[PDB]
Amino acid sequence: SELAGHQTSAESWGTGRAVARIPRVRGGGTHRSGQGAFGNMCRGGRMFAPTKTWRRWHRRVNTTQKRYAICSALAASALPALVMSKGHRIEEVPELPLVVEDKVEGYKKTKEAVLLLKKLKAWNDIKKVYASQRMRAGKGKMRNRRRIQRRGPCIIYNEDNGIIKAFRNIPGITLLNVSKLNILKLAPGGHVGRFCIWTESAFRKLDELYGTWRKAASLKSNYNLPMHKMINTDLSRILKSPEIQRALRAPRKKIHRRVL
Amino acid sequence: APSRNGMVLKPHFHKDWQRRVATWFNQPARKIRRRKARQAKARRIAPRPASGPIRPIVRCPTVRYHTKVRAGRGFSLEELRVAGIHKKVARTIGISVDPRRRNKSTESLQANVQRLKEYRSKLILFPRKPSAPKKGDSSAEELKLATQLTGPVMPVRNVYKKEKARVITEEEKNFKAFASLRMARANARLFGIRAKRAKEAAEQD
Amino acid sequence: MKFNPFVTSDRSKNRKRHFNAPSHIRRKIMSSPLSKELRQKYNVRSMPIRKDDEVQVVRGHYKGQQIGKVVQVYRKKYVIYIERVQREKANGTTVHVGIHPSKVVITRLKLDKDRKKILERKAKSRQVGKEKGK
RNA sequence: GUGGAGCCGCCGCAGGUGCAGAUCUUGGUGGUAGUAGCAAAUAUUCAAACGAGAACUUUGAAGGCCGAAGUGGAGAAGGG
RNA sequence: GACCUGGGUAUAGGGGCGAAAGACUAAUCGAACCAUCUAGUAGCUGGUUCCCUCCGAAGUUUCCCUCAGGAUAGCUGGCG
RNA sequence: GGCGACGUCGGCUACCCACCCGACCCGUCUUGAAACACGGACCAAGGAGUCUAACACGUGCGCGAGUCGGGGGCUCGCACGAAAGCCGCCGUGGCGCAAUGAAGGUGAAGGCCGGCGCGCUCGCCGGCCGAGGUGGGAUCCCGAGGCCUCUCCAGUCCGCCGAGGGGCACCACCGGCCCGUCUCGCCCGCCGCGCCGGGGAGGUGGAGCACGAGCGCACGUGUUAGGACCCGAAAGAUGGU
RNA sequence: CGCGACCUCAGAUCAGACGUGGCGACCCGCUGAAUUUAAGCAUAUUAGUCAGCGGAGGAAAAGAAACUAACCAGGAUUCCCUCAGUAACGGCGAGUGAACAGGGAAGAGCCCAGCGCCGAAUCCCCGCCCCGCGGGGCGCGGGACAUGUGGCGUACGGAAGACCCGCUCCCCGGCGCCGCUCGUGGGGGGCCCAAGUCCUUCUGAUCGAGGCCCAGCCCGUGGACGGUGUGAGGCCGGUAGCGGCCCCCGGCGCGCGCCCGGGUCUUCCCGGAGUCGGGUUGCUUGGGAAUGCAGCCCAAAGCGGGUGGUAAACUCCAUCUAAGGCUAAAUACCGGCACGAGACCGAUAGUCAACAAGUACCGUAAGGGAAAGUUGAAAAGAACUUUGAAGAGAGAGUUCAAGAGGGCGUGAAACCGUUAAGAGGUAAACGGGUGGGGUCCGCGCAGUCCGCCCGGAGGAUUCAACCCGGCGGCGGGUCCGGCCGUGUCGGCGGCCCGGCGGAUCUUUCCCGCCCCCGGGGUCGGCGGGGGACCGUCCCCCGGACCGGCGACCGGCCGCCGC
RNA sequence: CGACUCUUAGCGGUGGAUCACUCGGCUCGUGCGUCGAUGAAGAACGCAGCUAGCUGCGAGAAUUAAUGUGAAUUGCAGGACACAUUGAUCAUCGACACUUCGAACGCACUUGCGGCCCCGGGUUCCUCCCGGGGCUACGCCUGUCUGAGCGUCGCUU
Ligand SMILES: [Mg+2]
Ligand SMILES: [Mg+2]
Ligand SMILES: [Mg+2]
Ligand SMILES: [Mg+2]
Ligand SMILES: [Mg+2]
Ligand SMILES: [Mg+2]
Ligand SMILES: [Mg+2]
Ligand SMILES: [Mg+2]
């Protein structure tokens, strides 16, 4: 709210005079002559606790949680259960960490870009974005965002040689550098497992950018990949293992209902 | 108005603080603004090093900070005397000059004379027309770059000594104690009093 | 995608310049496509319509197979009038219903000194673009 | 059934977050009610005319009032 | 007749003017009116917007310019 | 096991009506309101616990004796990008890792063994380990013994087990340690022998030590300063008409 | 008496210039409250803020130490993070509250009076010309300023003058022109891809479907907007170190103009007064035996003076040089001109104002101050007939629609009219329980079991049983070929044509030096480099296991469809 | 029976909620950062063929010129279509113009009264005779002209 909404003379009538004790505008003549002025009740008054522009808008996240979240978002882009359960039709696609050769980075014409996604069998996700060419529900249209759209695949590269030019016309698609990854682009909506197409030179920098567990990363000064709370993580194998069921008593599979 | 166990607080908001509020919404837009002012200046002085002149070695004053080495304001006008370059020619070749600076240690003097001869060592001037007074050939095989960054000779280099390993010798492991400090502290605070008591004893006659 | 930071994208500020345009901007915005005989011959996609060009309407209640000259160009109401398409009132006095020039095909232009130069300039600006395709 | 161009489910996010009251704010509508009322300064009547249409307009005739410190004749300020 | 009155002119807010009534100062006067400080302050009145489930009070102690208010212990709930 | 058609069968809600029974008008302060207490003629829309700073505790997450770039810088000029990523001799600094006294200032490790100075209430040297001891203490370990179709020969298993052992965290107590003070006392050292320095033994004051738990981020609750849940004065001041 | 020179002053519609007033968000100088808080109220707080007054500028103010410090010292101003809610102030209550270190952003320094030297070597105005544009410069000639002091060199970091020493001739502005420019200098105008394809829905399509094996077309162009409804291709535009057109700039190189610099030694010169400081008073400050400012009285010195945060005397030491001046950048910007955006509001909201809004209206004035968006795709805005004096109707007509008819989208509630049903002396309404009537729905109406298996009665087709061929799958195996995982080593292999790291080592390696007697001595070392060693990650055989969500072939078992 | 009343519903009124729309706000950021005596801001009055407001203007008045653009403006008429003339319209905007008041400037503010100079016509006029034009505010700076002083002198008398 722009300033005071109190740019209006108003004092109460206070005394008797059989009207409520809200402040009234002064003068006469006009319609706005004894009407109730400012207060969060009144037509033309001032809103309750007007918003200030020094609300805390921006939030901090410390760096080793931002890196935790972006190691957790690449690893879920490599599991076919997780990446299909987000929406990306990856049914016809080959080997799930899709990498391609470094020739693709020097494409400059988007006809060379469309048939790549047809030959990788990744065009069918783009055709799912064309079906999601809806328009916005609600009042967001007059705040200039009328068209909603699906996010498709993201292509993560290094050494931009035209790859940004060949793909930026294809709808719902995203490019990002393998040096500077974005959790806002890898996990749209806060949900994990976005379909990603990689490149050879991109897919080989991840071992020097986040490290393995044996060596710390070289392109980040003091970062090593986070440790794992569970080693074995499929408990239908653990609970069926001979060491456990040698120790388990017996199942008590009766019911023993209430005796009348 | 208070309650159970908490702090007793003095918030400084008893004044009209909402007209004097500063919101850093332009602080992205001023960072890209002062980057562009560095870039458009770096090519305006195009061969000259960015971040300007060479700065001197300076030890910080206090008990807290006199272990460390800091870039300074300029050279004291006696370094330029001893290194042998004129003070009105020093700032036009790229040497920051501070005429109000004293060097009351010989050790801190000669480190900046050596710093200044090492600058003039790895400096290449450009002639107006190729006449070259006190100057030689073509520009050092075209000077290997154009512009340097964040310091001519990296002003901190706050280095520390080796002092490999000694054998604990006799009278080193014997004397130099905590009692050396407590006898030294009482000799500081009783020096002026005892010298008064020497004057009283000599006037006995 | 728009990349210039000096041209808008909002509905409120494009609708304001469209309805409050000057009358020389407003002829550039009342343009019309050409026919297939005429863009194979002048190799230009579209032109601003003027007073005596002859037109077949392509959409609406009146569609196709009636070549007819235009007769009046309301720029204030973004509307051209064509010599054949008309409408009877209750009075019995027939008047022209007006249609929009993007719903309109020019099948023969009107050539003067200046319409020749504009077609020549709009054509040369295309084979320069064909020479970028090396 | 009306209506004529937008809308919703799920997982997270964010609030100018849900009304019966504040002699609340603004707008609308009742009942009272076809009610109170249209009663200060004496008074109207006949015929006619024009008009779709006359207690009130006009015109004639009668009867009255103001009664020259005027309900008459002109002005100043004010109005425009 | 210390008469009634027009226009002109003078005096202005803790000021004016008053044959004095705290009268009068633009329907406002035991301190005008306009705008701002200002959304001033109130231990004091009024109001405080959806559902279901579970638990559930106190009006007593001690101190306070304290007595229509607080602080403190008791009573409660929530988390373990 | 039986019965029933073209108007009859079944059905319920914001349908109407009838009868029996029960039933005072809500909100609100209050010991008590149906009140001869106040607000409410009716209807629609609006309408009151917000944000910001500080602090406390709870909870979730990351790292962990550390932790955090928040302020800068770097990246090609990109819509989204007022984002994201990076720095590391950019960690300066903040908070924590050490307390204590007004200050000068000082500043947290003990127990077992052997030897000798009058083993003299006082002590000194050396080794060995090394955060004391007592009482409870989840868990764990050992466990005599015992438990199955014929008796003597042996090994995994399993469950019961009196008792014993090592005892986490935490609680209570005793002892010690550091800083301030107090009483009592003797000894030791010399960048120089003094109106010097250091030590002891007892009792006490401290928000201390006794093998560290913090930091950053998010949320919830509580309190405070701000117009501060909303509305309300009689006023005071400044400058004008 | 007069004449003249000056000195102090007057007049002019004298020649030529300048100042006034507006805006005021940000900045500078003043001046200045009270609400409020303290649960009262006086100091305090609010607050040196609001209001008042005066000045600017695109920034302004500040700014090159009469500084900080107290140790190995830093080195103009402003700004940011910290210092820090800290030292300090306070009915020591409520409350208030800096600075220096340190890390950054930006960085830039200078000038005069005085002191002396130089024949006033200086400046202003007018007259004509060398040469000139868009006018100001050197020159030629008088009238002034000025010795009561213009100009040159000169500044506290020292300066000057003279010897001697070793070097050097430079710079600035104008003048055309040629070449660029870092997002690729800025301004303006005019242009640049691809479906209007076939069928179909509709008032009208921008809908629905469809495009052979090149994926119907374009795409560095799928921002947005108008378009008879939802459009990459219909049309603006958008993309593009895209083109072409005109205009305006920052700096090459011909002619002006301006031209001795440094070093050592010697001699000589050297600084701002009613100011500092003190006393007192009032305000201000965190500034406390007085931080700053001001009035008044007193009033300096020159080995002086200020400061060194507890008044005072002595002493030593540190530090700066006051009472004159200028100065870019980093910083501020709720007014102006042009913009771009949004997790914002959507006509009682958002500015008071989406509209003929600071308007209508009100007050003598100061001043107060609204309400009010939407027919339709297009007016196609209802011709004509008839009733009435007209308003108003009945027809007719336009339109997808008048059930959109000129405040006309949608059209709620309160309230009213009328119709239909029902009912009625305990005002009405209500809760529980039934009954009756009405509306409506469901089944379909004495006609609703649905699937499974079995034995039946006739009808029609073809696997299976079992084997042969077959591709695919599951499972298990010597883990065979490939595979890795953990320690244990070696070839120290690649370490010198290997990575990372190390407050490991090497004064016999290497680069300029410091210490004593041109050299010598490791004679003790400084900063920089080299390779030795430890701790980790890369290749080959050796060994241990495991064949793990790492697998392919081989033969087996039993599925499987053809 | 008929009215009156009550409750439901159908339809019509009264009313303008709701939803949908948005050439407006609001907030943030960026570039620039510019008024005036050569007459500003603001105010008054006037200007169209039919014009009240708003908006745009200034007696050249709903705009002239110039350059770009290239056939309209539009509620209705009227008139130029010519554009190998100069060309409608619109934008731009550098050339010209810009009534009265206002710092507001001859004095006043009552459209009041002047005072000098020049030019046209009347007394061929100097001496308060119609019209046109120019000048006439205050402070202040440098210079010029005039000259005040029992101010300080000099030569003279
Ligand atoms: Mg909605
Ligand atoms: Mg906008
Ligand atoms: Mg009650
Ligand atoms: Mg409305
Ligand atoms: Mg209705
Ligand atoms: Mg200006
Ligand atoms: Mg013109
Ligand atoms: Mg005249």
Side-chain angles (χ1 to χ4, degrees):
Chain A
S1 302
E2 60 99 22
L3 196 63
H6 299 280
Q7 47 190 356
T8 292
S9 293
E11 88 278 19
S12 180
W13 290 356
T15 58
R17 301 180 61 182
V19 293
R21 299 186 300 179
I22 184 73
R24 311 286 179 178
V25 291
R26 289 183 184 268
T30 182
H31 279 169
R32 189 75 187 274
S33 70
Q35 290 188 358
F38 50 84
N40 53 350
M41 295 171 284
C42 302
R43 179 254 174 84
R46 182 258 311 153
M47 66 170 285
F48 164 69
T51 53
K52 299 293 185 179
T53 192
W54 57 83
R55 175 187 289 165
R56 193 180 71 182
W57 297 105
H58 299 267
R59 298 294 165 91
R60 290 191 64 198
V61 177
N62 48 4
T63 55
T64 56
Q65 284 186 355
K66 291 179 179 176
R67 295 170 182 175
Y68 202 102
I70 207 159
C71 292
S72 177
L74 295 174
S77 67
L79 289 173
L82 293 176
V83 73
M84 187 173 285
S85 176
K86 188 166 172 61
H88 302 288
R89 183 174 285 178
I90 55 104
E91 185 181 1
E92 290 179 352
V93 84
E95 171 74 30
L96 201 275
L98 273 300
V99 309
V100 292
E101 74 275 19
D102 293 326
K103 188 170 89 276
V104 71
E105 293 174 352
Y107 287 173
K108 291 180 180 65
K109 186 175 261 75
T110 191
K111 292 291 192 291
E112 300 178 357
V114 173
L115 61 91
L116 182 77
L117 297 179
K118 294 182 181 178
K119 289 182 181 180
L120 288 173
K121 301 293 177 70
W123 183 253
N124 203 4
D125 195 1
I126 298 297
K127 192 178 175 182
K128 189 182 173 70
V129 182
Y130 282 113
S132 300
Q133 287 294 113
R134 303 167 290 119
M135 72 182 292
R136 178 66 61 87
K139 205 172 264 79
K141 300 185 287 295
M142 51 186 69
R143 278 86 170 273
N144 63 16
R145 52 261 164 103
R146 295 177 72 93
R147 288 170 178 84
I148 322 171
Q149 197 172 8
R150 182 184 300 275
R151 296 293 169 90
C154 59
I155 287 93
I156 168 160
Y157 59 93
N158 54 356
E159 283 92 12
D160 193 1
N161 296 316
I163 185 64
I164 197 66
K165 297 287 187 178
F167 284 171
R168 64 173 165 82
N169 210 175
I170 301 169
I173 209 162
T174 302
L175 293 91
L176 71 163
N177 193 2
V178 79
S179 298
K180 301 180 292 293
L181 289 85
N182 204 162
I183 194 62
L184 303 173
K185 304 293 184 289
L186 290 175
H191 310 293
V192 81
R194 182 171 179 174
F195 179 57
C196 60
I197 307 295
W198 291 83
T199 314
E200 287 176 356
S201 64
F203 194 75
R204 290 180 179 172
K205 192 175 286 295
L206 288 173
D207 196 74
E208 286 84 6
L209 210 147
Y210 294 92
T212 178
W213 286 278
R214 288 178 176 268
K215 64 184 182 179
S218 64
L219 278 70
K220 295 182 179 185
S221 69
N222 199 358
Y223 185 74
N224 208 172
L225 205 150
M227 292 310 297
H228 215 280
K229 188 176 286 188
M230 295 186 75
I231 301 300
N232 193 359
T233 179
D234 187 69
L235 60 92
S236 63
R237 181 178 293 275
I238 304 168
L239 301 182
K240 287 185 179 178
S241 180
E243 295 88 4
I244 296 296
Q245 290 179 356
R246 188 181 298 274
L248 301 181
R249 307 168 306 178
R252 193 174 300 167
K253 288 183 178 180
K254 290 297 293 295
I255 303 300
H256 295 287
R257 294 178 186 273
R258 171 254 185 87
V259 173
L260 181 72
Chain B
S3 181
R4 292 172 289 184
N5 201 1
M7 201 76 76
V8 47
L9 292 168
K10 304 288 189 183
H12 284 86
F13 283 144
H14 297 275
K15 201 177 291 187
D16 193 4
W17 61 272
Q18 288 176 353
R19 296 179 70 185
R20 286 88 38 76
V21 68
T23 63
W24 288 25
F25 285 140
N26 57 1
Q27 82 99 32
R30 80 174 71 186
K31 284 176 74 172
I32 52 96
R33 180 173 61 240
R34 65 166 67 98
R35 285 185 71 253
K36 290 181 180 178
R38 281 189 293 272
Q39 289 175 353
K41 181 253 181 65
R43 66 182 68 98
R44 184 180 58 82
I45 49 98
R48 270 72 67 88
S51 70
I54 182 172
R55 302 286 174 180
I57 293 301
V58 155
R59 188 169 300 277
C60 297
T62 33
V63 190
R64 184 173 172 183
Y65 295 109
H66 66 279
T67 62
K68 70 180 283 184
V69 172
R70 180 176 63 87
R73 175 65 183 267
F75 293 92
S76 176
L77 304 178
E78 70 171 2
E79 280 99 1
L80 301 169
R81 181 184 183 273
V82 173
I85 46 178
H86 185 74
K87 69 183 182 291
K88 286 185 283 294
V89 186
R91 66 180 69 256
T92 186
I93 303 299
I95 296 164
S96 63
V97 176
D98 186 68
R100 67 176 72 91
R101 201 267 196 92
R102 294 172 289 106
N103 292 120
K104 62 177 185 182
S105 176
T106 305
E107 293 288 327
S108 66
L109 180 67
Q110 297 293 321
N112 286 315
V113 180
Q114 184 63 256
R115 182 175 177 85
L116 194 60
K117 293 190 264 77
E118 198 271 333
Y119 181 74
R120 179 68 176 84
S121 176
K122 64 191 292 182
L123 170 67
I124 44 102
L125 277 79
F126 290 156
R128 278 84 191 275
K129 298 284 102 177
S131 68
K134 276 78 175 177
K135 176 61 182 66
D137 57 354
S138 175
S139 297
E141 282 82 5
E142 285 84 14
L143 64 143
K144 182 80 172 180
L145 52 86
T147 302
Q148 290 80 17
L149 273 306
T150 190
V153 290
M154 292 189 287
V156 279
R157 188 60 68 189
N158 199 1
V159 296
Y160 285 135
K161 276 77 179 174
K162 186 179 176 68
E163 291 181 352
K164 77 292 286 180
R166 292 177 63 251
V167 181
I168 32 99
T169 188
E170 189 64 32
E171 194 63 29
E172 185 175 357
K173 67 170 73 173
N174 192 4
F175 172 68
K176 191 185 288 188
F178 166 78
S180 296
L181 283 80
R182 298 293 295 160
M183 288 192 284
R185 196 180 298 269
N187 292 326
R189 66 175 177 85
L190 293 172
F191 175 73
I193 305 167
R194 289 172 179 172
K196 183 73 182 297
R197 271 73 168 268
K199 299 295 290 183
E200 189 268 333
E203 58 96 24
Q204 175 62 44
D205 193 4
Chain C
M1 189 66 206
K2 188 193 78 69
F3 290 149
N4 195 1
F6 296 104
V7 56
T8 74
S9 290
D10 42 354
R11 186 176 181 86
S12 177
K13 193 174 287 183
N14 280 320
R15 284 171 58 85
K16 194 256 187 67
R17 294 169 187 167
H18 185 277
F19 288 105
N20 297 117
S23 178
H24 74 280
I25 301 294
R26 192 172 279 176
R27 67 175 291 276
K28 194 189 270 83
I29 207 160
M30 291 175 68
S31 299
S32 62
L34 298 172
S35 67
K36 184 60 71 172
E37 192 272 332
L38 205 147
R39 75 178 66 177
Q40 184 267 335
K41 193 259 185 295
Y42 282 153
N43 63 17
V44 59
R45 182 68 183 271
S46 68
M47 289 305 293
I49 197 164
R50 65 167 291 162
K51 188 169 173 63
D52 292 327
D53 300 331
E54 46 264 24
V55 159
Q56 62 184 359
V57 190
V58 75
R59 290 290 187 267
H61 179 65
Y62 289 94
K63 292 190 287 183
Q65 284 87 18
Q66 290 295 318
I67 181 172
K69 65 178 290 296
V70 300
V71 73
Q72 191 186 8
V73 179
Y74 272 167
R75 290 179 187 173
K76 183 185 284 289
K77 292 201 282 183
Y78 284 96
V79 147
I80 66 170
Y81 295 109
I82 300 173
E83 67 95 19
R84 181 65 63 187
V85 52
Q86 292 173 356
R87 195 184 190 277
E88 294 289 331
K89 293 171 69 171
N91 198 2
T93 295
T94 183
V95 292
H96 296 282
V97 69
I99 64 169
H100 188 274
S102 65
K103 300 288 172 286
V104 146
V105 173
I106 296 177
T107 60
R108 182 176 175 188
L109 291 168
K110 181 179 183 178
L111 283 307
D112 60 350
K113 188 179 92 275
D114 289 333
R115 177 58 61 87
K116 290 288 188 182
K117 300 286 102 174
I118 295 165
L119 290 170
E120 180 176 356
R121 182 171 61 246
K122 289 171 73 73
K124 186 174 89 273
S125 184
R126 293 172 66 92
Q127 290 90 23
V128 176
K130 300 293 189 292
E131 289 176 354
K132 286 177 69 67
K134 292 182 181 178

